[PDB]
Amino acid sequence: AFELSAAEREAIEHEMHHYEDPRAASIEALKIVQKQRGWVPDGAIHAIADVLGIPASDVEGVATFYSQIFRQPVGRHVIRYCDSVPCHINGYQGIQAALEKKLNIKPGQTTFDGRFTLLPTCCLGNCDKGPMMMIDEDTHAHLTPEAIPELLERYK
Template identity: 60%
Template sequence: MMILTDKKPRVNVEAILTTQEIHDIEHQIAHYPDPRAACLDALKIVQKRNGWVDDAQVAAIGQMLGISAADVEGVATFYNRIYRRPVGRNVILLCDSIACFLMGAETLAEAFQKHLGIQYGQTTADGRFTLLPICCLGNCDKGPTLMINEDTHGLVGVNDIAALLEQYV
């Protein structure tokens, strides 16, 4: 017979996260009256190393913050810039809001997919680019807009794609 308890499974945080990640997360925790408030910061810290956050890292973050892995997962999946699976070295976020759609975002998306040889949610074979839609980049007056890593590019046309991508190794 299995006995159910309310104890959370323990993970070896030191075996999952780097010493620097642990230090940086602890530093963020110190800024909040409740450690749980550092969840998004912790996810960003961990994602910085590999570009995404795996299940073991989610569990380790939860343990450090005193919350369940499911709660950390809820935060991770709410924010569209926290990646739960591997992505390319450069992540292209194409805005698909109504403003960008009206300015040709659909045509731009098709051109990116053709140029890169991938569909939304996929990564190029060389691991250089991942292509994702995003609901709004807040750059509506310069649509269609996209973001590559942390760089926002507005008024992007189909003929701009090759030169734009050459800026990202």
């Protein structure tokens, strides 16, 4: 049975004090629980709702609308690669192929060890330095298919 930790509860409450309607803290509330669980467990949706005083259907709609909010289990280090047009010209396709080979997975799934999850992302606002990828909260620029195997090792 999911139970919000006191720290998570206090974090959501602090966020509620920054807006008129407590509903405005829903997006961050989903991010807090995620930062502590990797994703938003199904039980969290109802718990967050009780804290914000909003229908659980509303909390679920926000989570299933925003892409970064994960409603399905994810690996320890999520890998997001820019698939937009500037990076398409730079050659993200090679980076995607390199990641798929070194990980033996396809965009959208996690590795058997549960260390990495390959997810395509939209523009990362750094096309002058593309191709671009983000592992965890770290940004990597000027990507080359040869550097992929090494970059992944750093995220033990």
